[PDB]
Nucleic acid binder design. Structure first.
Length: 47
DNA sequence: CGCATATATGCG
DNA sequence: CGCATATATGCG
């Protein structure tokens, strides 16, 4: 299923929720630190 | 990693 | 909304 991943940022205290794709805040965090980091901070949500 | 499908924002 | 760009989940 198109499971939601919540992501949270140790450096800003911001949070997101996405099922994937080109998403604004999620793309900034990949720019700022990296996709490995960004995925490692994730959480799985059944939604 | 490459393909398929649903998701997700921006250019037009 | 059509398309480009990107990207999770799932098949293989």
């Amino acid at each position: 299923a198109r499971k939601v991943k919540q992501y949270k940022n140790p450096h800003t205290g911001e949070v997101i929720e996405t099922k994937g794709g080109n998403h604004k805040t999620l793309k900034e965090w990949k720019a700022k630190w990296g996709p490995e980091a960004v995925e490692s901070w994730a959480t799985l949500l059944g939604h």
